[PDB]
Enzyme design. Structure first.
Site, short mmCIF file in Angstrom:
data_model
loop_
_atom_site.label_atom_id
_atom_site.label_comp_id
_atom_site.label_asym_id
_atom_site.label_seq_id
_atom_site.Cartn_x
_atom_site.Cartn_y
_atom_site.Cartn_z
N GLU A 35 0.82 -1.21 0.00
CA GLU A 35 0.00 0.00 0.00
C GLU A 35 0.86 1.26 0.00
O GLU A 35 0.55 2.24 -0.70
CB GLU A 35 -0.96 0.02 1.21
CG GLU A 35 -2.11 -0.95 1.14
CD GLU A 35 -3.13 -0.58 0.07
OE1 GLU A 35 -3.09 0.54 -0.50
OE2 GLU A 35 -4.00 -1.42 -0.19
N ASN A 46 -7.55 9.34 -5.50
CA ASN A 46 -8.44 8.48 -6.28
C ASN A 46 -9.19 9.30 -7.33
O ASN A 46 -9.25 10.54 -7.27
CB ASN A 46 -9.42 7.76 -5.35
CG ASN A 46 -8.71 7.02 -4.20
OD1 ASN A 46 -9.08 7.16 -3.03
ND2 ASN A 46 -7.69 6.27 -4.54
N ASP A 48 -12.32 9.58 -7.81
CA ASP A 48 -13.52 10.25 -7.32
C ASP A 48 -13.19 11.45 -6.47
O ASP A 48 -14.09 12.08 -5.93
CB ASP A 48 -14.39 9.28 -6.54
CG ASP A 48 -13.80 8.93 -5.19
OD1 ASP A 48 -12.61 9.16 -4.98
OD2 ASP A 48 -14.54 8.41 -4.33
N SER A 50 -11.31 11.56 -3.71
CA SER A 50 -10.94 11.21 -2.34
C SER A 50 -9.45 10.92 -2.32
O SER A 50 -8.82 10.79 -3.38
CB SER A 50 -11.75 10.01 -1.86
OG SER A 50 -11.49 8.88 -2.69
N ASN A 59 -8.81 5.71 3.27
CA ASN A 59 -9.48 6.54 2.25
C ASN A 59 -10.39 7.61 2.87
O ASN A 59 -11.18 7.31 3.76
CB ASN A 59 -10.30 5.62 1.33
CG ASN A 59 -10.88 6.35 0.13
OD1 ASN A 59 -10.60 7.52 -0.08
ND2 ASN A 59 -11.68 5.65 -0.65
N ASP A 101 -15.68 -4.15 9.71
CA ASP A 101 -16.92 -3.62 9.13
C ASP A 101 -17.63 -4.65 8.23
O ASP A 101 -18.67 -4.34 7.65
CB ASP A 101 -16.62 -2.32 8.37
CG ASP A 101 -16.20 -2.55 6.92
OD1 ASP A 101 -16.38 -1.61 6.12
OD2 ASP A 101 -15.70 -3.64 6.58
#
Length: 129
Positions: A35, A46, A48, A50, A59, A101
């Site tokens: 990462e 990113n 979008d 973000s 993120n 999650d």
């Protein structure tokens, strides 16, 4: 801060990630390698709009506030800048919420693509822990 491999493994162990929700320590080290290349200051933007932050590339769309991702959430309740510290405490604590999650470590695309199903134990080989 650019961690060494065993340095990071030890730090992650002391913060409780070894076998957290059944993921052995090697998985977390492997994920961090691909990462961020073990660099706490890593950022990446990113499509979008973000941004991903820190050793585990968390993120801004969902997990932290960077003041420039409109309509986003802040589920770890932290400024994204906090994820860039040399002290990985904030990253680890937010990572624990992410992995809990429901999707496990599949949230980390590099883990899914480069760690999942491999001999992750190789990543802590030789380390004193």
């Amino acid at each position: 801060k650019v961690f060494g491999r065993c340095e990071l493994a030890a730090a992650m162990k002391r913060h409780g990630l070894d076998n957290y929700r059944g993921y052995s320590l090697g998985n977390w080290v492997c994920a961090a390698k691909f990462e961020s290349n073990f660099n706490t200051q890593a950022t990446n933007r990113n499509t979008d709009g973000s941004t991903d932050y820190g050793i585990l590339q968390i993120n801004s769309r969902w997990w932290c506030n960077d003041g420039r991702t409109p309509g986003s959430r802040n589920l770890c309740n932290i400024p994204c800048s906090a994820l860039l510290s040399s002290d990985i405490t904030a990253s680890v604590n937010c990572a624990k919420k992410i992995v809990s999650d429901g999707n496990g470590m599949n949230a980390w695309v590099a883990w899914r693509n480069r760690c999942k199903g491999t001999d992750v134990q190789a990543w802590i080989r030789g380390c004193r822990l």
